[PDB]
Subunit: 184 residues, 3 copies
Amino acid sequence: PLPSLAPMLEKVLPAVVSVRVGLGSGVIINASKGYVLTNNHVINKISIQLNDGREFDAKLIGSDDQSDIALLQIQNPSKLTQIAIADSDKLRVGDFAVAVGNPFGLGQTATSGIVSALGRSGLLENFIQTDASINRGNSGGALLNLNGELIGINTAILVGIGFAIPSNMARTLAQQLIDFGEIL
Amino acid sequence: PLPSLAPMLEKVLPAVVSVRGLGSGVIINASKGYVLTNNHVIKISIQLNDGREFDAKLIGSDDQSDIALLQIQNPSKLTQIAIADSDKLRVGDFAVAVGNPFGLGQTATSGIVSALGRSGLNLEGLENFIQTDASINRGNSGGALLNLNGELIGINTAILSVGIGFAIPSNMARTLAQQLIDF
Amino acid sequence: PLPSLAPMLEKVLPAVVSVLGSGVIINASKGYVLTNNHVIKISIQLNDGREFDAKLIGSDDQSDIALLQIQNPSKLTQIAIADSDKLRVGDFAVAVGNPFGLGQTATSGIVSALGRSGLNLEGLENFIQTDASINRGNSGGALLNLNGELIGINTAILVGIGFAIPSNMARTLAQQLIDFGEIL
């Protein structure tokens, strides 16, 4: 028996979705409400594709151009698996990170590495740095720890170093976008 | 005592060769002297780790998969690689990409199996092809993609998003070698 | 409890300095700091925010190595140095930096190639190859093993193609630069 990242990647698989509008990935944050976190540049009609092949309509709740974060609500949700979210403030340089995606809907894409830099100490301000490859194949998807908990959302808009939006900020700006949509 | 990838890399070292306009190659059949390499890389000469030089004949290639089969002229004391079932591969499995160009020594990159088939790139023809975040460059192209046991899972191809590398899976390269051996 | 590279990175943090580039404290008492000749009035900034003046002792253009002496040193932490002759392709490597003292930058990987094995270019016979990303953010800094001991000095001036001056050579050139500046 060989060590692998496949046993934790399989439990996370249904929470990571394909986004068709023009492709990218997304993450199910709330299954009951069908709230999916993805990237603004990916969407500038939206459809979401699960791992099991199921297709759903999705409406843009709102976005933040500066963080490249966009919140989507799937139209009539059912049998959805949501991701566990971790406190990104507890992240340390050297922690292991896995960047997961599912574009085209044909299967999971994963890259591995470490948390390289936090804050203004690398190369934006609020962003997370990782040596795990962030490309068009996992952009919009999840950045997880070895427990399979969301520590950030990958963004390819900006060497071997990648950017992710920390989960705490991704959660807060989703709440602010939900609240605004509730005044509307 | 530190954990390292060098112990498994030392047992695999004689099976990875220097294809001499240079590159790497893998000994699949010790007795017959069958060496798997890339088409773009390729008179042909092969150089072992121990410095031994051998003549090699081209017995067939596939432009689409960028694979090429070579047979070592007058083989002797050859170490072949163990081959693994690439169908049993899962995204997240650890991968090590080894090479030996110029014959000066072993080159290795580390990573994981990133995507299988058309999952990472939906381009027609990309089916079966394994994806890895282990760097695939001119220094290990033609060489072996290995698991933590040192068994061949793929043949490294430095052809094509950025940060991801492509390799021919072991089942596909073994079943292409069989076709090239006959016709 | 998750495995991480953060527990070893925290003990090594004070030995890596801000120089724009990085540098490594080799002798705490004398304040000798190893950095890249290409990044070189010089000021050094510690992790704790302390800023010191530094004088150029000497440099080696061929190895891209420069040795600096901290003017009036105090409470310095030096790095443990490992025998780079004992390195093997496949050994794990961590490339650490701290440009502008704002925080630690780290990349992870393996020792990829040694004796000019990766690129048949004259002059690379003395250097180390790594698949750990070597960029402007860790160039001048330390290449470490899993024990937190120096195995090399990152040099970005020369895909997983990163270069580092091995620790044995970097130590030797420092003594030779000390001795020379003594005869003068």
